[PDB]
Subunit: 455 residues, 4 copies
């Protein structure tokens, strides 16, 4: 149903809300970009589930046993062994977080002019692919771009689209397939095991490599257990292990499903690629024996990845998100459906029908939720999508959304109720939300520090 | 109206989540005595609110700054400053917990044959009074002994009974008035400020001392703010300070309202008694500047007492307990009323009205509660009452209860739902609850290690 | 020789020294009692090895896994199992520190008017024995009272003295033998295994009980390994286990050799005594399942007791003390010999030859070492010895000493050099140290808070 | 004169203390490559001073107060304030460590074909300069290349070489001057304030930028205080602030002089470059307000940088390294001179003068050192120099050294004695040290995983 937390609270941090008049000053001081607000001025911080998780007593015990040696740290061996056991890959290179591993993969596996195809883009991933000379091709099925369509396993790759790509371009012009689990910008939507099998079968027959974005793979495994016929009595760990058996390697931001505040890694099976990866990690991250992490953080990530396999933990994690979505849907608030593993996405096009996407309604809605509730949320729409690196025009995604992102093990259902009640009230006078225009635009990943003004 | 938690989760404590059939085996291995269960086998542990609290990030930062010097630790001076500021007593002596301070007070303040009068009693407090020669007298208002009477400030002293004692025994033969806030034995019932001032006025005219058992004084202060006319504009801190302005000293268990896992202290205004207390603390506890605590623990207690003064924290603490009581009462489950600041007491005599008291209904209900939910609660009935070792017969208390004692900042409303739903389900077939019989009974402390089997 | 530290530094705390002019103000503000100086005004704090130790990374990991449950804590089970394994006693009752366990033993095992005989007195131990009606008899051999006499195993009981006691008083009038390892006030002097065997053999033939003061038993085991013929190839743990095989129980301050900042316990083999001990611990300390300690402190004590068994750790501990003694002796500074396990004792009678013991030269020397070096040390002489509870006169010990007490794993050899150099310079003008007289004297354990003035 | 540690030990790190014959087996299993040893097998780990430091109790308190928000963390604002105050730069961007900041600076400040000139180089710094199109020029004073020349401020830039570069290539073709403090590759040699001001004066007249590699800037500042006339009355903080007043920005590895285990940052004064840096940091590291660090780590680095300004701390840090160098030099052991701020370099070419460089004398000496003492040191000779993959021949460095790199606040003078005594003993029969040959050699990063056997 909605289960209670399968843990107790060991330690707390205080929350507080500043008056509406002062939030109004803060939002315009931040140029109406929620990324630019200060943590102390936020009451419930749903900007991201990345690095914001609460660790366990066992992880904090591991934090006291950091072996900070430059080479041969016990913490590295623990992390390496844990990932080999749970994911099944032959080799691991730690990185300080996920985009560090993406930096390595894109430099190792892309020849300029080749294609990289994935189930919907992501911001840092697509930037590193294009920066190294690849053309991104979206091979997610069309349904994943329709926010309201409630169907299972929306993250699945369209095998017909993948096949057409191989036929029009040729397999040797495809650097690799990028399969993300879950799919973040479709709403945290899962990929089925059947789809991972079929993608593996078709790519292998053409010699094309498959690399997973593993960042929310445990959430994805929960959906397989819950909804894919035949997996109902498999453990989360068995599902995770089988998932990665259809891949040649992975990038991972441990800051998501490894239940830590920093950390990531790169996995692969190929020996020559591992050799090249170790040469490159030294330049950007650190020695292959710590990869830009303190020993104590490799330890916490090794412990957290194993905690994430507990069924009751991930069931509660996902159903707590679902609770927030269910309360918003029962009141008529338009959301992306089905609710995904890590966040509820408000459909900003339906919330702000009076605005065109060129007026940045998602960015505008996020500012308004902060001013009316003190809750921080993130823009996931035209601002995040960036510009086309050939024409200079906005990428125009069908999904213009505002993300209420739930950190793991941090908030309660009563906090979800506070969030839901505040958004339901804002819905009543949604016509009051104004369009926005750029006054400062970065040349890449512009959503991080852009500044706006009301039209 | 039930407020959301005025904090978020910084770190979590692991639990195992064993299912019902396994919980049944654990309960049988414990001989159906919840006191014998292993902590690692318990999902929600409501045995006591003493020392089971979750600390904040600020307290844990203080735990890293323990000055472990034997004398003159900076942590002692921080604790001393905090207690002098918030409680307003001239002098303070730390103790390892509350019954350490009681040991000291009773040796300092009692001449043999004298009387100590209180608003009911607690077992350790009254033991140290009687061990040092005092005769205990209950001067609580008669209503406190009616567990179904729903009235405010049930812990108040009957001023008439106090006056009768003074007239019948003489002021010079009364060692002190022991005023407890809240009154644990009545179910955690508060005392009004008007009552505290009347007691201070009457005693001061006869030269009689008043010492507070201050263990849940912050919960008491919230009741004054919520329900006593004239205190709606006062802060929790202002109410706490005025409360102790009507006392000559106090004993304090930090393990309750100071939000720590260990610690207590003794306060007084009289220089002479302070001098004598310092001569005695080294006998049982330690130096006047650590009193049987590590430096880091004096530090955590100094920080936690100040955190307890936040209105939102204590409002939520008391209303979370109230939520559990309200939910049970709405389903018809019999409880002590009103609900107190720290616990809900089930009336097992009425819950298990098909069982006689010699079949230990509270002990059996507590066993059933664990089996059905994974919740541990405390027997507070005939078993805890002990046996008259002269005659061999049970002590038979009027109150036959199960205490659901709520640690501070550890559980959520969803955990409260687990507790309530399980008990409500048990109540709907309460006639299936079986009686218990002794299979092992020790000579003393029988509630701690006795084992039972079903009749 | 003098080995290097068999550990690395994991974390530090800053030290500083305030000018001589300000130390002079501090010492007279403290009434010339070093117990009354503030930790922040001390540069190197050698007041005591009690509770001042540095814990390890493994202990701090255990501190993050405190199971704070009132009954059935995993931390209690770990401590109980560790003590049963390493000491070999059947039963354990935790206490918040050593004098808590002494309080329990003295109340359990003493009938008023009986004799308790031990190898030299200690302050808290003797107070609890006399408070419960016993007469203390010293059965240490005479040599232990001669500071300069360098002989091995000065802590040994004189079997002839023990035999005479049995003959003059009768075995039934002796409550028990108190055997301390090491013997603190003789200078931290060890007891031989042969002596523990012989004491066991003679007491057992008369039905007299033997209880050990186990507080520095690991230091004592090191001396046995180093110097007792036949033990050179036994492990520290084997020696510890055999030592306690000659005892009926023990009191322990974990604050010494268990490498913690708080904690102790009481061990015994007799079932009825354990039953009585559990009834009494509830009054003074807490439930038998935590005994006045947080769960995390039972955990740290269980881990620390096992760390203490590492040969290289205890060898370095003892040889670091010896280094300080050797440097002082090489310069001609009079000390107690042989150097003991935990401290160097300056012979205040030889340091202050110009003073009589009634002028409290040890107390005076401690004040002077602070004023000239900022190092804190403790009086261990006529002030600590207290008054005779029949005549009212000073107990007059032959050992009038000032103790430089070394906390475990806190200071380096360079710190020892700083201490030695400062004391050697004070030695040059030792005639400048003045006699002291009481201006405030507590009625018991007077050394803790007494205030003095120069004669 | 060598000062005592200006701190005491708060907590210790466990080590195993394995004996010589077992250390020999560990060294053989590591193929005689110290880089392949397990940390758990090492007593004293002198492989690097990077990230191996011991933190204070205050830093660990800050570790409990990590604000893990994705944007606007309070810990970032604390770090920003601290760096602006102590270094005096207008703007700061955090990075996960030093080579992250170097990546950013080189992309921001270099147009392809331009020159970057420095006082020697470090491998990661120069890689990012060359990767972005720069041609490196060494402008250090010629004396820095004489490893036996005992003169002050060996890291100084030759102003004549700088002027020649400007005249020969033109100011518009020089991207920046890279001034390192200290100069790692010369053995940790400092730069004078007079040199920094002369470089700033000369560059400023041509519009050329100067950026500092600030990694060991506090050790540098101590040398200025100790040895540059006119700075004897200046605080470490005053010297640090003046140093950076001669730069346009810096790259900083907190893993060195900020006394942390992870962390770095980039500073600059130019608003435009700051804006561009913020657009780039999100590509590789993270948000401008966390830059690939956990909140708790920005907090530890803010606290640690301020602790590094204490004169007594940095005096003892540098003089502990000097102690090791002095002891070796007194016994005739050949070292690079003068001893630098962070390490002693053994001259393995002269130590093992019976071995040719093709027999890897530094690699073999480092193996022998571990076997005899349990000390790990780093090869800095022909193995680390790598192989010319075009021709197949070794890169043959003039310096064939073993680096004994000293982490901050981890070891004592007694540990330094273990290191020195072992090396001095080896030197007394240096002709017994055997040559090594490759048995496994990887194509790149060969010093990390190569394995050897004896000739
Ligand atoms: C920061 C976020 N995402 C990070 C992310 C990344 C990049 O990871 P780091 O933030 O750890 O670099 C990669 N792949 C996916 C699917 C991700 O969601 C976020 O969604 O808030
Ligand atoms: C342990 C409990 N009571 C402690 C207590 C105490 C004794 O405090 P310590 O447990 O800290 O000794 C004193 N006074 C009152 C009113 C108390 O409730 C309990 O109710 O479980
Ligand atoms: C405090 C000290 N001694 C404590 C002690 C005690 C009392 O322990 P607590 O301080 O843990 O109560 C008992 N027995 C011996 C031999 C002791 O040395 C000291 O010597 O500084
Ligand atoms: C890791 C080392 N050096 C780091 C370093 C770096 C790179 O810093 P990170 O290791 O923090 O990337 C930059 N500049 C200098 C002068 C350095 O010494 C070392 O010497 O072992
Ligand atoms: K590190
Ligand atoms: K302590
Ligand atoms: K506790
Ligand atoms: K974070």
């Amino acid at each position: 149903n909605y289960p209670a937390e399968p843990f107790r609270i060991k330690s707390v941090e205080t929350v507080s809300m500043i008056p509406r008049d002062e939030r109004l000053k803060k939002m315009q001081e931040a140029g109406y970009n929620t990324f630019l607000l200060n943590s102390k001025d936020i009451y419930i911080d749903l900007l991201t589930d990345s690095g914001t998780n609460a660790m366990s007593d066992k992880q904090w015990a591991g934090m006291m046993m950091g072996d900070e040696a430059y080479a041969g740290s016990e913490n590295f061996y623990h992390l390496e062994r844990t990932v080999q056991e749970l994911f099944g890959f032959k080799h691991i290179v730690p990185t300080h977080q996920g985009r560090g591993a993406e930096n390595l993969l894109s430099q190792l596996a892309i020849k300029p002019g080749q294609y990289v195809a994935g189930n919907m883009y992501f911001t840092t991933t697509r930037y590193h692919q294009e920066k190294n000379g690849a053309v991104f091709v979206d091979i997610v099925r069309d349904e994943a771009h329709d926010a309201g369509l409630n169907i299972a396993f929306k993250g699945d790759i369209d095998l017909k689209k993948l096949q057409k790509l191989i036929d029009e371009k040729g397999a040797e012009n495809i650097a690799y397939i990028c399969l993300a689990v879950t799919v973040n910008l479709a709403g945290g939507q899962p990929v089925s095991m059947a789809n991972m099998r079929a993608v593996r079968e078709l790519t292998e027959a053409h010699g094309i490599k498959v690399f997973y974005d593993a960042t929310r793979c445990v959430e994805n495994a929960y959906f397989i257990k819950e909804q894919e016929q035949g997996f109902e009595n498999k453990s989360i760990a068995e599902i995770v292990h089988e998932m990665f058996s259809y891949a040649d390697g992975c990038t991972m931001s441990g800051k998501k499903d490894c239940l830590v505040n920093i950390g990531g890694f790169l996995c692969m099976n190929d020996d020559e690629m591992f050799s090249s990866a170790k040469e490159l990690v030294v330049v950007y991250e650190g020695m292959p024996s710590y990869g830009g992490l303190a020993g104590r953080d490799m330890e916490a990530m090794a412990i957290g990845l194993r905690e994430a396999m507990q069924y009751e933990y991930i069931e509660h994690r996902v159903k707590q998100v679902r609770y927030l979505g269910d309360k918003l849907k029962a009141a008529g608030v338009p959301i992306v459906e089905p609710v995904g593993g890590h966040a509820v996405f408000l459909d900003a096009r339906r919330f702000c029908e009076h605005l065109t996407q060129d007026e940045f309604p998602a960015q505008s809605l996020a500012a308004s939720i902060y001013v009316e509730t003190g809750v921080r949320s993130m823009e996931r729409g035209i601002i995040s999508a960036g510009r086309n690196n050939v024409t200079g025009e906005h990428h125009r995604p069908k999904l213009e959304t505002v993300r209420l992102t739930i950190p793991r093990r941090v908030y309660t259902y009563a906090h979800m109720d506070v969030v839901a009640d505040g958004i339901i009230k804002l819905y009543q006078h949604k016509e009051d939300i104004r369009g926005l225009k750029f006054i400062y635009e970065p040349k890449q990943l512009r959503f991080f520090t852009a500044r706006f003004d009301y039209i």
